[PDB]
């Protein structure tokens, strides 16, 4: 535990990138989070929305 002041700086920067990547799975209220899925389900004007 004594060296943990450097280890926490490593941990926060790993957690920050994992949070940034996990947010690719979110819909944000869209029909899907997968971009090719949106473009397969819907025609151009609705897919753009």
């Amino acid at each position: 535990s004594a060296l943990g002041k450097l280890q926490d700086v490593v941990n926060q920067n790993a957690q920050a990138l994992n949070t940034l990547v996990k947010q690719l799975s979110s819909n944000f209220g869209a029909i899907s989070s997968v971009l090719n899925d949106i473009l397969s389900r819907l025609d151009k004007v609705e897919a753009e929305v």
Binding site: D43, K44, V45, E48
Partner: protein, 49 residues
Amino acid sequence: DSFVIRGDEVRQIAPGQTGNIADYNYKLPDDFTGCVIAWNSNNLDSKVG
């Protein structure tokens, strides 16, 4: 731009549509600035037989 069409297919005369009229007869651009005006012409354009 002027033509006769079937009353059902008038919906294809709009930006970002797909179908036999949209893709094989008359295609509007997605960023269209304009007005689409239609009227029924059964008294002019139909024939007995």
